[PDB]
């Protein structure tokens, strides 16, 4: 539930927000995309698993963790996306094609959105372009993200949280620097006003020899969390791998339906054929001779047309879309 330096905020500019996307994945054949942010989805304050609500960073000087519900999160690239699942840092969602991806949290009028560029194109499988999986068609081998949230595409490492400096912990009065920790909290302070000097103060505390607040820093001794190795956070010195969590929504194998293009009409002339073809969408026709030279040809076709293809005594083979290979032998 840390904060990342999102490049594009709600308004126009970069900010530091809980909802920074720091990586995006779209290799799934069905168009589903896996997203990675700094929030913890499906978790309450203590981290207990509960789908209905999630936890995230809080815009306050104590910077505790505060929580919200599923219904107020939205995802969109060009039009609104549909959430397919969520766990911890990661989301899975189905999105319309677009050039960027945006995640927005809507706490009433507080609509905090983070946007990151990523070209997501409508992708298909098979040898025929199609908008939608056909109701009827061949069941061909495909690979798509598994909706099971307990799966694992891998593992990501996390480390002890690094520094989190503040100047609200500091205060200037009559050209003197004081540290004001939150009530009952031991806050680690360190400063250099000439000599370098460190310490921990749990209460309103003076420091001497200091006239500028820029020379001193204070921050909580917060080891009670684990943070992803993000580039947007200055790091703890002991950056050993202190935890490995799974990468849900493994890219699993399955079968997908793909369309069946028009059955060609063969029109034959001496040592050659004339295939009359219809294909509303881009369909791949490939051919190859069966002699010493394949002379293989490939072509993506739309509309209706006709192709004259010489066939020799050795023969010819062609595949029209997802149909089976067809072989011929001339005389």
């Amino acid at each position: 539930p840390y904060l990342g330096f999102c490049p594009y905020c709600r308004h126009s500019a970069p900010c530091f927000s809980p909802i920074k996307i720091e990586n995006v994945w779209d290799e799934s054949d069905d168009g589903s995309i896996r997203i990675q942010v700094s929030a913890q989805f499906g978790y309450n304050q203590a981290g207990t698993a509960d789908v209905t609500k999630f936890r995230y960073m809080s815009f306050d000087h104590d910077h505790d963790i505060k929580e919200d519900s599923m219904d107020k999160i939205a995802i969109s690239t060009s039009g609104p996306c549909r959430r397919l699942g969520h766990k911890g840092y990661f989301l899975l969602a189905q999105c319309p094609p677009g050039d960027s991806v945006t995640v927005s949290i809507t706490s009433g009028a507080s609509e905090n959105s983070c946007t990151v560029e990523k070209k997501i194109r409508r992708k298909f499988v098979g040898r025929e372009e199609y908008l939608f999986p056909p109701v009827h068609g061949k069941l061909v081998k495909c690979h798509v993200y598994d909706h099971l949230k307990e799966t694992s595409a891998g593992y990501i490492t996390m480390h002890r949280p690094g520094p989190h400096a503040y100047k609200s912990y500091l205060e200037e009065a009559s050209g003197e620097v004081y540290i004001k920790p939150p009530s009952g909290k031991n806050v680690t302070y360190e400063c250099k006003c000439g000599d370098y000097s460190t310490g921990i103060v749990s209460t309103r505390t003076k420091m001497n020899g200091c006239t500028k607040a820029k020379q001193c820093i204070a921050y909580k001794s917060d080891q009670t969390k684990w943070v992803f190795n993000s580039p947007d956070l200055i790091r703890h010195t002991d950056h050993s791998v202190q935890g490995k969590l799974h990468i849900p929504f493994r890219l699993t194998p399955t079968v997908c339906p793909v369309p069946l293009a028009h059955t060609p009409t063969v029109t034959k002339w001496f040592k050659g054929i004339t295939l009359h073809l219809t294909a509303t969408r881009p369909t791949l026709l490939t051919t190859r001779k069966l002699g010493l030279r394949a002379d293989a040809t490939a072509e993506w076709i739309t509309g209706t047309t006709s192709r004259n293809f010489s066939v020799g005594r050795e023969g010819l083979e062609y595949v029209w879309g997802n149909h089976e290979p067809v072989r011929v032998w001339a005389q």
Partner: antibody, heavy 124, light 106 residues
Framework: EVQLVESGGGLVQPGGSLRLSCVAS????????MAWVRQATGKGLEWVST?????????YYLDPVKGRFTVSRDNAKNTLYLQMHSLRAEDTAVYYC????????????????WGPGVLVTVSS | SYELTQPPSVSASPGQTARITCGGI??????VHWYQQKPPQAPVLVIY???ERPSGIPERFSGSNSGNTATLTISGVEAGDEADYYC????????????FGDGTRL
């Protein structure tokens, strides 16, 4: 070569005073915090005092040695100093003058270079 | 004030791995440092910052710290590893005190 060499120790009566010297070489004496650390015979190492850098404005001491033992430094001759007053029997020990390497965030201090040490004995 | 406790002794024939533990309240939240001593020679730092070492320390030495326990792990013990070992930390809330452990012999 980075080397720290102690001197000045020996036998002293209880209630006496002494001045331990430690000359430094091979590094910028003014750039590093320094310390005196103690080891009694058959006991563990125990920290005595630290003097900061470059001017040594802030000096830190162990609780019983406050008000009696004083650290000082001089960057011109690169020499650390510990003056002792009102010496007592348990001060009998070997002292190492130690260069201090301090890392800002998280605040952490560990000693890198030590001298061979010098013995003081406090007995009647 | 933190109290550092180590076992008074650990016995290890050569060839295997030896673990020496430093115990203290909530020491996992701070950075421990392990020093090795052959009396009367001055000790030598072998671990600092819970996971990393000065130059020249062989690859067999490793350190860890978590919760209430820090651990010095020495794989493939040899005769030369027989030494005193002291865990260290810098309790800065206690007026910049440098607290050492009681010690452990190998």
């Amino acid at each position: 070569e980075v080397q720290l060499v102690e001197s000045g120790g020996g036998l002293v009566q209880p209630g006496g005073s002494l001045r331990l010297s430690c000359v430094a070489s091979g590094f910028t004496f003014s750039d590093y915090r320094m310390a005196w650390v103690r080891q009694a015979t058959g006991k563990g190492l125990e920290w005595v005092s630290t003097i900061s850098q470059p001017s040594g404005t802030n000096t830190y001491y162990l609780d019983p040695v406050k008000g009696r033992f004083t650290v000082s430094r001089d960057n011109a001759k690169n020499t650390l100093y510990l003056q002792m007053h009102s010496l007592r029997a348990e001060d009998t020990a070997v002292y190492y003058c130690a260069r201090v390497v301090t890392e800002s965030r998280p605040p952490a201090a560990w000693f890198d270079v030590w001298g061979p040490g010098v013995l003081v004995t406090v007995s009647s | 004030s933190y109290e550092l406790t180590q076992p008074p002794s650990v016995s290890a024939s050569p060839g295997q791995t030896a673990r020496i533990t430093c115990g203290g309240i909530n020491i996992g939240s701070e950075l421990v440092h392990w020093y090795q001593q052959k009396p009367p020679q001055a000790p030598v730092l072998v671990i600092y910052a819970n996971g990393e070492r000065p130059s020249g320390i062989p690859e067999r030495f490793s350190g860890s710290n978590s919760g209430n326990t820090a651990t010095l792990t020495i794989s493939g013990v040899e005769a030369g590893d027989e030494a005193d070992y002291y865990c260290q930390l810098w309790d800065i809330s206690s007026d910049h005190n440098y607290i050492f452990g009681d010690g452990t012999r190998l």
